[PDB]
Amino acid sequence: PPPELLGGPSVFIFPPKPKDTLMISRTPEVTCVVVDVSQDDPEVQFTWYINNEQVRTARPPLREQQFNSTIRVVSTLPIAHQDWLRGKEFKCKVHNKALPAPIEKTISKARGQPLEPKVYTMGPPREELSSRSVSLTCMINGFYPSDISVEWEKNGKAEDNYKTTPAVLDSDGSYFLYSKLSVPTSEWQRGDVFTCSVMHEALHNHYTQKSISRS
Amino acid sequence: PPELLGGPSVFIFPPKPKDTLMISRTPEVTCVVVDVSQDDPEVQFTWYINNEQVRTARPPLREQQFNSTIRVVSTLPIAHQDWLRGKEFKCKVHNKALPAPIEKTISKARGQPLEPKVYTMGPPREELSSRSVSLTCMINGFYPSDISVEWEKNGKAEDNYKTTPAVLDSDGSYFLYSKLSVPTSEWQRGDVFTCSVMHEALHNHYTQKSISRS
Ligand SMILES: *[C@@H]1O[C@H](CO)[C@@H](O[C@@H]2O[C@H](CO)[C@@H](O[C@@H]3O[C@H](CO[C@H]4O[C@H](CO)[C@@H](O)[C@H](O)[C@@H]4O[C@@H]4O[C@H](CO)[C@@H](O[C@@H]5O[C@H](CO)[C@H](O)[C@H](O)[C@H]5O)[C@H](O)[C@H]4NC(C)=O)[C@@H](O)[C@H](O[C@H]4O[C@H](CO)[C@@H](O)[C@H](O)[C@@H]4O[C@@H]4O[C@H](CO)[C@@H](O)[C@H](O)[C@H]4NC(C)=O)[C@@H]3O)[C@H](O)[C@H]2NC(C)=O)[C@H](O)[C@H]1NC(C)=O
Numbered sequence: 001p002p003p004e005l006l007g008g009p010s011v012f013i014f015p016p017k018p019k020d021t022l023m024i025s026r027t028p029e030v031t032c033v034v035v036d037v038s039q040d041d042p043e044v045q046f047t048w049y050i051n052n053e054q055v056r057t058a059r060p061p062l063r064e065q066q067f068n069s070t071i072r073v074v075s076t077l078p079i080a081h082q083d084w085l086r087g088k089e090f091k092c093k094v095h096n097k098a099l100p101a102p103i104e105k106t107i108s109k110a111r112g113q114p115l116e117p118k119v120y121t122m123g124p125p126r127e128e129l130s131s132r133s134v135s136l137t138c139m140i141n142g143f144y145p146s147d148i149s150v151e152w153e154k155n156g157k158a159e160d161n162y163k164t165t166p167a168v169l170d171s172d173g174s175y176f177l178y179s180k181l182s183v184p185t186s187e188w189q190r191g192d193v194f195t196c197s198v199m200h201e202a203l204h205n206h207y208t209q210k211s212i213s214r215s
Numbered sequence: 216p217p218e219l220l221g222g223p224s225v226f227i228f229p230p231k232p233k234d235t236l237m238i239s240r241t242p243e244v245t246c247v248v249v250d251v252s253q254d255d256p257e258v259q260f261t262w263y264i265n266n267e268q269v270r271t272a273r274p275p276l277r278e279q280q281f282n283s284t285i286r287v288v289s290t291l292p293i294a295h296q297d298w299l300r301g302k303e304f305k306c307k308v309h310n311k312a313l314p315a316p317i318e319k320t321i322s323k324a325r326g327q328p329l330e331p332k333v334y335t336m337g338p339p340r341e342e343l344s345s346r347s348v349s350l351t352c353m354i355n356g357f358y359p360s361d362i363s364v365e366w367e368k369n370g371k372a373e374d375n376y377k378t379t380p381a382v383l384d385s386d387g388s389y390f391l392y393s394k395l396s397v398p399t400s401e402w403q404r405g406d407v408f409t410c411s412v413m414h415e416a417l418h419n420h421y422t423q424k425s426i427s428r429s
C-alpha cells in the first residue's frame with residue numbers, strides 16, 4: 001500500500017559545506033531536494049536565483065526511485081565562494097503538475113559581522129597518563145557565524161581518531177566548540193607534535209593551526 | 216498504520232537527567248501533540264509503563280499556537296527507578312480527526328552504564344592577557360548519554376558557563392566539554408572553581424572536580 005501523496009511533493013534546501021566555501025580549490029554547492037514526487041506526475045523543473053536574479057545550473061536534476069514508491073529529485077547549484085560568504089540569498093523554485101503552485105525555498109549564510117575563532121590546544125590531564133591512550137583538546141572560542149571546519153594532523157599527515165562537538169552558542173552571541181584527538185600514550189610521551197587546524201571565514205587566508213607536544 | 220495528512224502529530228520526550236538522578240526531584244515523561252484542529256480540539260491520553268496502563272494526575276494542557284493550530288501537552292510523573300531500570304513509557308493519543316490512535320514510546324538507552332571520567336583544565340596561557348579566561352571540564356567515557364553538568368565557586372552556583380551536547384565517541388561511549396568563563400583576576404588570585412557532574416553510573420550519582428591556579 002503506497003503513499004497517497006494527497007499534498008503533493010515537498011522541497012528542502014541545503015547549504016554548502018563550510019570547507020567547500022572556504023577553500024578556493026573546492027566547488028561549494030547549494031542543494032534543492034524534492035521528495036514525494038508521484039509516478040503519475042514525475043516531471044520536475046527547477047529555477048534557481050541569487051538575490052532574486054535567475055541563474056543557470058549546468059547540472060541536470062538527479063532522479064531516484066525510492067523504497068516508498070516515490071521519486072526523489074535533486075538539483076545542485078555550484079556557486080561562487082564569495083556569493084555565499086558575502087551573504088547573498090539563494091532560492092530554488094520547484095515546478096510540478098501535482099503542485100497547486102510552485103514551491104520556493106531560500107537559504108543564505110547567517111547574517112552579522114564574522115568573528116575570528118581563537119584556537120587553543122591543551123595537553124592530556126595528568127590523571128590520564130596512566131592509560132594506553134590520552135586526550136588532546138583543541139578549544140575554539142568566539143567565532144561567528146557557526147560555519148567552521150576542524151581537523152587534526154601529525155607530521156603533515158591527517159589524523160583520523162578525533163571527534164568534534166557541535167558548535168555551541170555562547171553568552172556573547174559568538175560560538176565555541178571543542179575537538180578531542182585520542183592518541184596512544186606512547187606517541188604523546190615520546191614527543192610527537194600534534195596539530196589542530198581550523199578553517200573559518202574570519203581568519204586570514206581562512207586558515208589557522210595550533211600545535212601541541214609534551215613539554 | 217493509516218496516516219492522516221495535515222492531522223495531529225505526537226512527540227515524546229525523556230525526563231531531565233538531573234530530575235532522574237536526584238531523589239528529591241520528580242522526573243516526568245512528556246507527550247506533545249501538535250497540529251490539533253479547532254474543529255476537533257479534544258485530545259485524550261492513555262499512558263503505559265511496560266504495557267501496563269497507568270494514570271497521570273496531570274490534566275492535559277491545551278495551548279493556542281501562532282500558526283492557528285492547537286498544541287496539547289501531557290505530563291507523566293514517573294518513578295526514578297522505572298526510568299533507570301529501562302522500562303518502556305508509552306503514550307497513546309486519541310483524537311476524533313485521527314483514523315487510529317497515535318502511539319509513541321520512549322525508554323533509556325540500553326547497555327551497561329559507564330561512569331564519566333571528569334577532568335578540569337586551566338586557561339591557556341594565551342588568555343591570561345585578557346579580562347576573562349576559560350576553564351574547561353572534560354567529561355569522557357560515559358554511557359548512556361544522560362548527564363547533568365554544573366559549576367560552582369565555593370558553594371554557590373556559577374554563571375557564565377556553557378556545555379556542549381554529548382558526542383558519541385569511537386568506542387561507543389559519550390563525551391562532552393563544559394566551559395566556564397571567569398574574570399582573570401579571580402583565576403590569578405587562586406579562587407577555586409568546581410565542575411560537578413551527575414550521572415547514573417557514579418557512586419551516589421554524583422562526582423565533582425575542582426580547578427584553581429595553585
Ligand atoms: C518517501 O521516502 C523519502 C526518502 O526517504 C522521504 O523523504 C524524506 O522526507 C522528509 C520529510 O517528509 C525529509 O525530512 C527533512 O529532512 C531534513 C534533513 O535531511 C537531510 O539529512 C537527512 C538525514 O538526517 C537525510 O536523510 C536527507 O537526505 C538530508 O541529507 C542532506 O542532504 C543535503 C543535500 O543533498 C546534503 O548537503 C549537500 O551535501 C553534498 C555532499 O553530498 C554537498 O556537500 C552539497 O554542497 C550539500 O548541499 C547534506 O549533506 C545532507 N545532510 C545529512 C545530515 O546527511 C530536515 O532538515 C528537515 O527538517 C526541517 O523541516 C521539518 C519539517 O518541515 C521541521 O520540522 C524541522 O524543524 C526542519 O526545519 C528546518 O530547520 C532549519 C533550521 O534547523 C530551518 O532553517 C529551515 O527553514 C527548516 N525547514 C523548513 C522550511 O521547515 C526535514 O525533516 C527528508 O529529508 C526526506 N529524506 C530524504 C532522503 O530526502 C519521504 O518522506 C517518504 N514519503 C513518504 C510519504 O513516506
Ligand SMILES: *[C@@H]1O[C@H](CO)[C@@H](O[C@@H]2O[C@H](CO)[C@@H](O[C@@H]3O[C@H](CO[C@H]4O[C@H](CO)[C@@H](O)[C@H](O)[C@@H]4O[C@@H]4O[C@H](CO)[C@@H](O[C@@H]5O[C@H](CO)[C@H](O)[C@H](O)[C@H]5O)[C@H](O)[C@H]4NC(C)=O)[C@@H](O)[C@H](O[C@H]4O[C@H](CO)[C@@H](O)[C@H](O)[C@@H]4O)[C@@H]3O)[C@H](O)[C@H]2NC(C)=O)[C@H](O)[C@H]1NC(C)=O
Nearest residue numbers: 226228229230231242243244245247249250280282284286
Ligand atoms: C504549528 O506550531 C507548532 C508549535 O511550534 C509546531 O509544532 C512543532 O512541530 C515540529 C514538527 O512538525 C516539532 O519538531 C520536533 O521537535 C523535536 C524536539 O523538539 C524539542 O525541542 C524544540 C527546540 O528545538 C522545541 O521547540 C520543542 O518544544 C521540543 O522542546 C522540548 O520539549 C520537551 C517537552 O516539553 C522538553 O522536555 C523537558 O524535559 C523533560 C520532559 O519529560 C522534563 O519533564 C521537562 O519538564 C521538559 O521541559 C525538552 O527539554 C525540550 N527540548 C528543548 C531542546 O527545549 C525533535 O526531536 C523532532 O525531530 C524528530 O522527528 C523529526 C521528524 O519530524 C526527525 O527529523 C528527527 O530525526 C527526530 O526524530 C521534531 O522535529 C516541534 O517539536 C513542534 N514544536 C513545539 C513547540 O511543540 C507545528 O509544527 C506547527 N504546525 C505547522 C503546520 O506548521
